[PDB]
């Protein structure tokens, strides 16, 4: 029983570690894109003035 449980838990923790890494990369990309878009919005604000 115990070895079954550890095998299952190791597989689960590996899968969810991979998902965590994917989320981290997603957040980094989103921060970069928000930076670019806010800079573009600043340029457009100055052009509006």
């Amino acid at each position: 029983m115990a070895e079954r449980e550890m095998g299952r838990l190791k597989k689960d923790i590996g899968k969810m570690e991979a998902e965590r890494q994917e989320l981290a990369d997603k957040i980094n990309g989103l921060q970069n894109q928000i930076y670019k878009n806010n800079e573009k919005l600043d340029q457009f604000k100055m052009l509006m003035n």
Partner: protein, 436 residues
């Protein structure tokens, strides 16, 4: 799509007695060979052609050969309720039993009857067009299932080879066994059972006693009771070729789906729901709970916890009214369950075949009427425990050279005793590394 079957020993021919007691009623054949003229249960002329082949006007002959050396039981089959069903030559009976001596059944007696059996196997495959494969029923726990069974197995393999071989082998029980000298015959047969038979199905006596005591509540079951549900399992796994379902898988798919590696063909078996005649109705029966009961180790035809092992692949044959959605809903919960664990070397491990035909009830039987059924057959690593305990049983008999002379004075040298044990050990270590 026709399949022929051979039954060797006594266990094989009694299991076949049950199987051909069930097929005749399932296809509606009266137990003399001709379909009733008035009533017409079911339909489909080609439906019965897999197991019964028409002859002349209206007599249907089976596609099995009951071969044995001791005539005491073949004569009982000859004179019993099935006289006009079988063919007079498909009941091969020698003169003297194999007497639990594997060497005697393999060399002395078996050598003069295997060719006679082949003379009829060939002539029975001659009048079959869409031949699928062979099905063998035997118990290696003796002298005719092991010896003559092996001999016929390799002699068929050398002759046909291409056609698959589905075996249903009744090994010696964990503890509740009959003969005293099984641990010799078991290894002596497994050595030639690894690399010759294609897909073997492990069967036990003790486990089916346990099923009959906890499910049908018959506190004193018998060989008739066990063979009845064995025949039920055989029919539930061969229903695909005969009855049309949405997702139906025949012998070839069943083989190519469940054998990831060449010599890893050693399976469990289970059937659901084994329910008494009185509790046929009080229990809510549906796909979820019948599938749940299809995996519980208390409902396994071989007394070994699947929890000890890791599943490699599984197949589920469904009967009757089963929509192909709740099956997936159930296997999802099976995956989310915690006790049973797969192996990372396989991400998808279910083959859920379905057929639209409810199971049949034999008259005056121990099984009730249920609208559906599940036959579960799965590869697993827990059978290494069976082979290990049997190795331990063999070692004690071998280290004292007990019972050896009954073999060596009949033709088998010590070399086969050595090499069969060596190859069983190789099998066990292969299971170890595959489960690793």
């Amino acid at each position: 799509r026709e399949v022929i079957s051979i039954h060797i020993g006594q266990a094989g021919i009694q299991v076949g007695n049950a199987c051909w007691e069930l097929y005749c009623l399932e296809h509606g054949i009266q137990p003399d060979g001709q379909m009733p003229s008035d009533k017409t249960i079911g339909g489909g002329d080609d439906a019965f052609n897999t197991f019964f082949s028409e002859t002349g006007a209206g007599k249907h002959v089976p596609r099995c050969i009951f071969l044995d050396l001791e005539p005491t039981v073949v004569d009982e089959v000859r004179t019993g309720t099935y006289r006009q069903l079988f063919h007079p030559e498909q009941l091969i009976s020698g003169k003297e039993d194999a007497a639990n001596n594997f060497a005697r059944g393999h060399y002395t007696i078996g050598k003069e009857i295997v060719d006679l059996a082949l003379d009829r196997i060939r002539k029975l495959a001659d009048n079959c067009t869409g031949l699928q494969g062979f099905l063998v029923f035997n118990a290696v726990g003796g002298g005719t299932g092991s010896g003559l069974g092996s001999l016929l197995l390799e002699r068929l393999s050398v002759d046909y080879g291409k056609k698959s071989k589905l075996g249903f082998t009744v090994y010696p029980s964990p503890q509740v066994s009959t003969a005293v000298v099984e641990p010799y015959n078991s290894v002596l047969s497994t050595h030639s059972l690894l690399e010759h038979t294609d897909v073997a199905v492990m069967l036990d006596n003790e486990a089916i006693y346990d099923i009959c005591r906890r499910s049908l509540d018959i506190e004193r079951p018998t060989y008739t009771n066990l063979n009845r549900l064995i025949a039920q399992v055989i029919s539930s796994l061969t229903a695909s070729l005969r009855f049309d379902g949405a997702l139906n898988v025949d012998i070839t798919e069943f083989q190519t789906n469940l054998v990831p590696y060449p010599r890893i063909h050693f399976m469990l078996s289970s059937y659901a729901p084994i329910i008494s005649a009185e509790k046929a109705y009080h229990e809510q029966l549906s796909v979820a709970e019948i599938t749940n009961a299809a995996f519980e180790p208390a409902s396994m035809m071989v007394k070994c916890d699947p929890r000890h092992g890791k599943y490699m692949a599984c197949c589920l044959m469904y009967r009757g009214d089963v929509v192909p959605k709740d099956v997936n809903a159930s296997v999802a919960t099976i995956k989310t369950k915690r006790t049973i664990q797969f192996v990372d070397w396989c991400p998808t491990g279910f083959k859920c075949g379905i057929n639209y035909q409810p199971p049949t009830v034999v008259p005056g039987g121990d099984l009730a009427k249920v609208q559906r059924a599940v036959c579960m057959i799965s590869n697993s690593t827990a059978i290494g425990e069976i082979f290990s305990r049997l190795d331990h049983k063999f070692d004690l008999m071998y280290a004292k050279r007990a019972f050896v002379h009954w073999y060596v004075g009949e033709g088998m040298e010590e070399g086969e005793f050595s090499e069969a044990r060596e190859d069983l050990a190789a099998l066990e270590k292969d299971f170890e590394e595959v489960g690793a």
